[PDB]
Amino acid sequence: AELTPEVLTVPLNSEGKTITLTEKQYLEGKRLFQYACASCHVGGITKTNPSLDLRTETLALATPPRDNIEGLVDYMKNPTTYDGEQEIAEVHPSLRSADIFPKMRNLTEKDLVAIAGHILVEPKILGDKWGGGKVYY
Amino acid sequence: METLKITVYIVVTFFVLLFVFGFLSGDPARNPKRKD
Amino acid sequence: ANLWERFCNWVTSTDNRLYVGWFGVIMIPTLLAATICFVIAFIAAPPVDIDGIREPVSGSLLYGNNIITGAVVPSSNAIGLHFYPIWEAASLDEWLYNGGPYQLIIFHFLLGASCYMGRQWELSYRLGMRPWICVAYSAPLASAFAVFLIYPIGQGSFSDGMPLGISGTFNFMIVFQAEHNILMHPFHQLGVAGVFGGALFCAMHGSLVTSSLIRETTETESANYGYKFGQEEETYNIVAAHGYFGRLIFQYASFNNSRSLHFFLAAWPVVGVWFTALGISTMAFNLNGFNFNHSVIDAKGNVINTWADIINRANLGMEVMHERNAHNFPLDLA
Amino acid sequence: IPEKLAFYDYIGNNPAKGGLFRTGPMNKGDGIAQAWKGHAVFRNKEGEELF
Amino acid sequence: QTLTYDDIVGTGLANKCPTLDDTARGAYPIDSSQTYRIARLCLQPTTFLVKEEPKNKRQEAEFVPTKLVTRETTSLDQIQGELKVNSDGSLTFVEEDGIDFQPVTVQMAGGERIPLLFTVKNLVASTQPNVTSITTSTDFKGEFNVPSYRTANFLDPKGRGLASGYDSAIALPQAKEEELARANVKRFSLTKGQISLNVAKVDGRTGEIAGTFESEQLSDDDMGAHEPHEVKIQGVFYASIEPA
Amino acid sequence: METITYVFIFACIIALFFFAIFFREPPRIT
Amino acid sequence: MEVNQLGLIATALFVLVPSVFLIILYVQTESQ
Amino acid sequence: MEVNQLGLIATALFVLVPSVFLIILYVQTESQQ
Amino acid sequence: ELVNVVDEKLGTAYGEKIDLNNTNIAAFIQYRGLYPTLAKLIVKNAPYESVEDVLNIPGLTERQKQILRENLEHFTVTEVETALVEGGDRYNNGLYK
Ligand code: CLA
Ligand code: CLA
Ligand code: CLA
Ligand code: CLA
Ligand SMILES: C=Cc1c(C)c2cc3nc(c4c5[nH]c(cc6nc(cc1[nH]2)C(C)=C6CC)c(C)c5C(=O)[C@@H]4C(=O)OC)[C@@H](CCC(=O)OC/C=C(\C)CCC[C@H](C)CCC[C@H](C)CCCC(C)C)[C@@H]3C
Ligand SMILES: CC(C)=CCC/C(C)=C/CC/C(C)=C/CC/C(C)=C/CC/C(C)=C/CC/C(C)=C\CC/C(C)=C/CC/C(C)=C/CC/C(C)=C/CC1=CC(=O)C(C)=C(C)C1=O
Ligand SMILES: CCCCCCCCCCCCCCCC(=O)OC[C@H](CO[C@@H]1O[C@H](CS(=O)(=O)O)[C@@H](O)[C@H](O)[C@H]1O)OC(=O)CCCCCCCCCCCCCCC
Ligand code: HEC
Ligand SMILES: CC1=C(/C=C/C(C)=C/C=C/C(C)=C/C=C/C=C(C)/C=C/C=C(C)/C=C/C2=C(C)CCCC2(C)C)C(C)(C)CCC1
Ligand code: OEX
Ligand SMILES: [Cl-]
Ligand SMILES: [Cl-]
């Protein structure tokens, strides 16, 4: 098996447009995810609220949906609750709240998509492991 | 308990003074060779 | 002369069957207290709520244990690191429940064993000896401080010290592996080399001295009577043992200096054991063993398990089952 | 009638009903006493009290 | 006075309810057009008594004294709820929330340990009718729930439980399951308790009261595995009433 | 009965310590 | 505790028999 | 038969202990001459 | 005479659907728009006679009543099981990942 463009092709928006990624961008978005997010989201779980993971299926049923890049990039600017009714940038890192979450201050728009595509790619690779927790380690 | 506490404190103290004063009593001279 | 001096001379007397000394003045009463409390608790102590969850663990023979399952049980997690003398309890009944005998025993013992060490120095000074035996004993002593003192400190509770029991000791080892991966720690690898290598060199030194005993007896008597005590001369030909072992391997892998040979035998296990006790003492602060879980992956990103990944599945089963009613939240942070 | 008194009035607690190699406590033999059943009264068909 | 955490810590006083002066024997008027609440209710046990198992002959079982072995961990406090005025004039308190349970272990002569969930959960305590003011002769009587001492996830030493765990005795693979059922099958009990609160000190200025309480409830039965004991708990209580 | 057996053997060993120390063959110097 | 009842006799003879062997051999050394 | 289980430990000790005693004294009697 | 009440419950509709009177609040993540806002409301008002009494919860917005309608087929109600709802277990049942 290898890292291919069909692997690296993830939903861009909910209109079913897609985008294909490079080796460089997936690895780029792995590094940034490690840097900025994995302290809480290692392997697709959420340590501080294990009821919400980054499985693409969970991301799908979010309001708004987040199983695409634009939805994810938006969440990283203006995060909401699962159901969409509450902005939570006061506690969840985001560009909006980069004055209290410093690690976000220097993230470019090209960076947030790198991370989103990583998130959307990684479960194509690992399947159940991603978002599964220790049962699958 | 109070009684027990006081008795343990005194016991511990007595034993600790024996120890300090024993090594202060020219412990370096006590040996089978040169008495400094 | 005067009283204080007649007593000082009795204390430091080299004619007592057992040396007392000033270290011995602290050692004796504290070992006596530890030993008497331990014998009574092992036999008769009622159950002890070790994990602070009102789930008492029976450790004593009269409450259904045998020699292998019994133990004096660590004090409760609700105590954590607080001092808990008998006088701090409202009743012996409370004290027994919350695990007080464990605190009484390990402090009197740690204290009395540290003075054992000083006593070894003290009698060597009265005897005109070189002083460093006590240095060797410091390797076991240090190991005991680790499981009974240092590890509770780093983890915030004497409830996580080693139990005073055969099975309780295994309990402590298994939970240590899940929470720290001690098998993957180099200091414990240094400890195994410590004691395998010690036993090796023990079997070797004995086997090679016994091989080179000088015919002093006939075939019907123990060879052992070929040695008499305090005899001026040696009872084995070291030149002969070097010639045998120097050829078993090669000539310079073999010791021919008696002094170099014994210092080697002292230093190997002492150092190794220093390292494994240093290793328990630094895992007390959660600086844990090597972690190579999901360290090998293929072109696409699939995890190619190694033996380290199999170890982690074991570790994980210990992790999720230990202290099964004691965790309310998803991480076990101490 | 206090039970303790009626329990004395029972040959099972008579010390001269034992046996040399019948070992252990009295409870190993007739068992552990639990309750008094009451004082038993026998009458024939005529209604005479019988002993 | 206005003491602080650092004044109190380690002293045993965190397990004590507040008290009112020998001289607070006044009375707090109840404006029936008005609404009320207990802003803080505190219950502090001072003695635990267990009913003894009278033998088959029996005659009578008494409540025997017991030794507390779990330290100053026993009090119920920060309890809140609304004090309604009923139509016959009585006052009824309805608990909402609060630290309204403490697990407790006491020990009977001979060495038997008796755990119990000392609780007033869902308490509902009422006064006699036509109470226009609360006084140093006012009483409430009430009932509460006592849930199982362990809850559904609790596993036993062989790994058995209700919402989780082994459902059999796995160390005895081919034993007859039949005599093991009461220990294989975890049951979750919910029983009722009873409590009387006797107001004996009132401070009508501040709205505080203080008195004694005595409750009766069952001890832990260990998810069905043995029979519980009857337990009687006595202690003191303190309350603060505010206009709602 | 089993507790009694464990404690009896333990007790015998303590007795053996006592004799082995205080009633040892006294070593001497030929 | 439902322990094995031959355990007592097994422990007892496990102690007694080899201990008698040693005592027999020590005492008859001391008397020659 | 439903027999006394200490009967066995009892008989064994009844036999062994006086016997070992007699043997110990006999063998050290022979070791003299 | 002695049964595991939780095991019995898995043979009821609790075992197929979200039991509005019993199920832990994390099960509402399964469907779009219920979590967390309405999950809290469902549970806080929990004990219901029929699944549809849930449309009568005070304060529902009109989008809320419509989401619930969309997800009435995924709900059921059974008798409250004491072991399932005590201990605040509906809010946290000890299960994480
Ligand atoms: C060499 C003797 C010795 C030593 C060093 C210890 C040491 C200890 N014992 Mg042991 N103990 C001993 C002999 C000894 N014991 C004997 C012989 C008995 C049987 C009677 C006991 C019975 C015993 C019990 C029953 C308990 C201990 C406990 C302790 C611990 C704390 C004792 C304490 O509070 O010290 C406090 C001591 C001091 C503050 C004195 C310090 C020395 C200064 C220089 C003097 C200060 C003046 C002093 C306050 C004046 C005393 C009177 C005043 C209060 C009115 C400590 C590990 C307790 C324990 O293990 O808790 C976990 C415990 O519960 N011990
Ligand atoms: C098949 C045989 C075998 C061999 C060769 C080893 C070898 C080793 N194991 Mg291992 N072990 C074995 C079986 C074996 N084990 C078994 C059956 C068990 C139980 C299941 C264990 C359990 C075990 C544990 C728990 C640990 C080890 C560790 C070690 C290391 C230290 C060994 C040591 O200090 O011994 C003492 C021996 C000496 C002091 C003599 C020196 C021996 C060395 C290795 C020879 C050097 C080779 C030489 C340079 C080449 C030729 C020289 C010539 C050119 C002059 C070493 C790699 C430790 C480890 O993993 O460290 C990585 C450790 O943590 N072992
Ligand atoms: C082949 C496999 C193997 C081997 C060889 C070892 C070897 C070792 N392990 Mg490891 N271990 C293993 C597998 C193995 N382990 C596995 C699989 C696990 C995971 C489950 C662990 C988990 C583990 C832990 C968690 C610990 C070890 C420790 C140790 C060391 C124990 C010896 C020690 O501390 O001596 C040191 C000497 C002493 C402890 C003795 C103190 C003596 C006192 C001072 C005197 C007591 C006197 C007594 C009370 C009275 C006697 C009087 C009498 C005459 C009447 C040693 C290097 C321990 C260690 O490193 O300790 C620091 C430790 O804590 N191991
Ligand atoms: C005066 C001494 C005395 C007395 C009166 C008792 C009395 C009692 N004991 Mg106690 N006991 C004693 C000494 C005594 N004990 C001693 C020394 C010990 C330690 C060995 C014990 C250990 C002990 C235990 C462990 C138990 C008792 C129990 C009992 C009770 C019932 C015992 C029973 O069934 O006997 C049975 C008696 C016999 C079958 C008679 C045996 C006589 C033999 C046959 C004589 C041997 C003959 C000889 C070899 C012939 C050769 C002679 C010729 C060649 C020269 C009873 C209250 C029991 C009880 O109920 O406790 C709650 C129990 O379990 N005792
Ligand atoms: C588990 C392994 C282990 C044990 C048990 C052990 C034991 C001992 N080693 C001693 C010595 C030594 N061991 C040495 C090197 C080593 N020792 C090693 C490993 C061990 N050594 C290793 C691997 C090495 C090589 C580095 C040296 C160099 C020495 C000595 O010099 C010394 C000695 O004298 O050798 C003859 C003795 C210390 C006597 C003493 O302190 O009396 C004081 C205390 C007494 C007498 C009574 C204590 C009773 C207490 C209160 C009992 C209750 C509390 C216990 C801790 C309960 C524990 C329960 C267990 C089941 C865990 C003792 C026999
Ligand atoms: C088909 C064919 C090829 C057949 C032809 C066969 C043929 C004739 C062979 C040709 C020769 C040849 C070698 C061919 C090539 C093959 C070859 C290279 C073989 C490889 C063999 C092999 C890998 C062996 C590895 C070596 C190994 C075992 C380790 C050595 C390491 C080593 C030095 C360890 C010992 C360490 C050490 C010194 C321990 C001390 C222990 C100790 C404390 C001792 C105590 C002690 C010591 C004393 O000292 C004295 C005094 C006394 C008192 C005493 O107590
Ligand atoms: C580039 C990286 C940076 C570099 C880093 C360098 C670090 C290396 C440090 C060098 C250390 C110096 C050597 C040690 C001191 C010394 O030689 O000892 C003194 C003697 C002197 O040797 C004896 O020497 C004698 C003469 S004399 O005393 O030297 O003068 C002679 O009489 C005798 O025959 C002979 O055996 O040495 C020995 O007797 C020989 C064996 C030496 C064994 C090593 C010592 C310690 C072993 C512990 C190992 C722990 C393993 C843990 C296991 C789990
Ligand atoms: C801990 C401090 C966190 C860090 C660092 C990051 N996130 Fe997070 N994330 C956290 C929580 C508590 C939650 C739940 C929010 C809620 O609704 O209460 C989340 C959630 C997300 C989601 C939503 C996933 C879903 O299932 O709907 C996403 C997509 C997400 N987080 C992404 C994310 C990224 C990319 C981060 C790095 C830049 C990151 N999070 C940091 C906690 C924490
Ligand atoms: C004087 C002197 C000396 C000596 C000393 C001594 C000898 C001491 C002793 C001491 C001791 C001798 C001590 C003791 C102690 C003890 C203890 C401290 C114990 C405790 C115990 C306990 C507390 C227990 C309890 C219990 C249990 C555990 C269980 C069951 C129940 C009961 C409760 C009983 C010398 C020579 C040095 C010199 C100097 C002088
Ligand atoms: O107690 Mn004893 O053990 Ca060290 O981690 Mn946390 O805590 Mn408990 O858990 Mn895992
Ligand atoms: Cl555990
Ligand atoms: Cl926790």
Side-chain angles (χ1 to χ4, degrees), chain A residues 26-97:
Chain A
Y26 164 90
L27 302 178
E28 178 55 359
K30 196 176 177 182
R31 169 187 90 85
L32 294 160
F33 180 92
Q34 295 198 357
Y35 161 83
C37 322
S39 78
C40 299
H41 291 292
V42 73
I45 60 176
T46 306
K47 292 209 181 273
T48 49
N49 190 345
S51 297
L52 269 351
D53 54 70
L54 311 175
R55 282 177 191 299
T56 299
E57 317 93 75
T58 309
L59 296 176
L61 273 170
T63 283
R66 314 287 188 171
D67 60 8
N68 55 82
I69 298 163
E70 279 181 355
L72 281 165
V73 162
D74 169 78
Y75 186 96
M76 286 156 80
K77 301 167 155 187
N78 186 61
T80 66
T81 44
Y82 196 60
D83 66 355
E85 297 230 351
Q86 285 240 276
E87 311 199 312
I88 67 173
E90 236 168 17
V91 293
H92 191 288
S94 90
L95 304 190
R96 185 156 156 210
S97 57

Side-chain angles (χ1 to χ4, degrees), chain I residues 13-41:
Chain I
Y14 173 98
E16 335 172 30
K17 308 203 173 300
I18 286 175
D19 186 351
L20 298 178
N21 293 337
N22 288 281
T23 294
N24 164 271
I25 187 137
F28 292 93
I29 280 139
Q30 279 173 102
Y31 296 119
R32 197 196 296 287
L34 309 172
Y35 186 79
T37 307
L38 286 147
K40 172 163 166 199
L41 284 171

Side-chain angles (χ1 to χ4, degrees), chain C residues 131-176:
Chain C
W132 293 313
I133 289 165
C134 73
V135 171
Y137 178 62
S138 88
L141 188 57
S143 304
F145 269 84
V147 306
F148 294 141
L149 224 202
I150 316 307
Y151 189 69
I153 292 179
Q155 299 302 309
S157 173
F158 292 114
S159 100
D160 271 349
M162 189 174 109
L164 307 181
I166 285 169
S167 286
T169 299
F170 313 141
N171 179 268
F172 168 94
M173 307 179 75
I174 298 163
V175 177
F176 217 93

